[model samples]
Target: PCSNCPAGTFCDNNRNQICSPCPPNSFSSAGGQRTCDICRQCKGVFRTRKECSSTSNAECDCTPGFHCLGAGCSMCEQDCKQGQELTKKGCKDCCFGTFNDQKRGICRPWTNCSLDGKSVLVNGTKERDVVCGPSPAD
Candidate 1:
């Protein structure tokens, strides 16, 4: 009879061999696997989402306050906080007359209430955009 190893284990020989559990930091996702694969190391900006197991490979993603730089999320860069943006020269505060209230967001120019035939109900700041409303007739 032709039998095969089950998932989470690997067989050393193709013929008449016993299956053994995958070693630490290794995995075999399917049965009949001849060898286990080494798990990926969650280093740099990546944090482990799932620990490596005999049946499954390790999972990883970017850590808090950081974002992936490449497609594989292998490299990481600091994510700008509120009122700031990730510029070519690195994180920079919102420029004059512009505002940003969300993390990793670009600054937006302030609304011209007067030009738009509206009133400035609230002034714009680096952390918040301006609020415009109906003009108050004096």
Candidate 2:
């Protein structure tokens, strides 16, 4: 007579004997089972999880500028690019007269010169540094 085996065991119909142990990263609740269930893959920045099998394990990956610390995904230390301001909203522009060079990650001053009878001198310090001179009419 064919009877169910203990949990974690499979019946080989051909020989009617318990099957071999489940593969790595797999589990079997029932003592007697035909096959082991494959474990699910970890997603996002989670790099590790409890053992799927008695001897098997798993892990996840982290994206760029981010660190996989502790139990889940975390922000990378000093990961902000140059020329960008680190704000609560992440990287931001450097403000007026300051040009953000993404490649360099730095805010640089603008440089150029122009003159008129009524002159305004724009400085490279910031976009708002303008020196206004009185016109003849004024």
Q: By lDDT, who's the top model here?
A: 1
Judge candidate 1 against the unseen true structure and give its global Cα lDDT, from 0 to 1: 0.80
Scored by lDDT, model 2 comes in at: 0.50
Candidate 1: give the clashing pairs: none
lDDT of 1 by residue, 14-82 (tens): 545777777767998986877899998897768998888888888788889887665556567788777
- TM-score between candidate 2 and the true structure: 0.31
lDDT of 2 at 13: 61
- List, residue by residue over 80-104, the lDDT tens digit for candidate 2: 5545544443555566666554643
Top model number, TM-score: 1
